[PDB]
Design a binder for this molecule. Sequence first.
Ligand SMILES: [Cl-]
Lengths: 6, 96
Amino acid sequence: EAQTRL
Amino acid sequence: SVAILQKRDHEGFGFVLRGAKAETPIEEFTPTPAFPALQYLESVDVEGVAWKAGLRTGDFLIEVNGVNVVKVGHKQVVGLIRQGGNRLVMKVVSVT
Ligand SMILES: [Cl-]
């Protein structure tokens, strides 16, 4: 998985 | 549900997206009511834009700006989110 703050 | 997000240039939407990388075998994924999409909200900042639009931790992403993302990898979903700039529409299903 990847995690991205938006 | 559908959340409509419209923010200022200098601020974030106020959520963290987590989900499957495209490099994994995402082609083998079968959506189910218990796990309905590859990407979901790890967290939502309280009183942030996403929060005020009704999004909550655990929401699974079904559509971004009218594009189905149930079986789409993380980087491509992030690209669709960023493409609208300060404006974003997301259809989600709540695990809760
Ligand atoms: Cl990815």
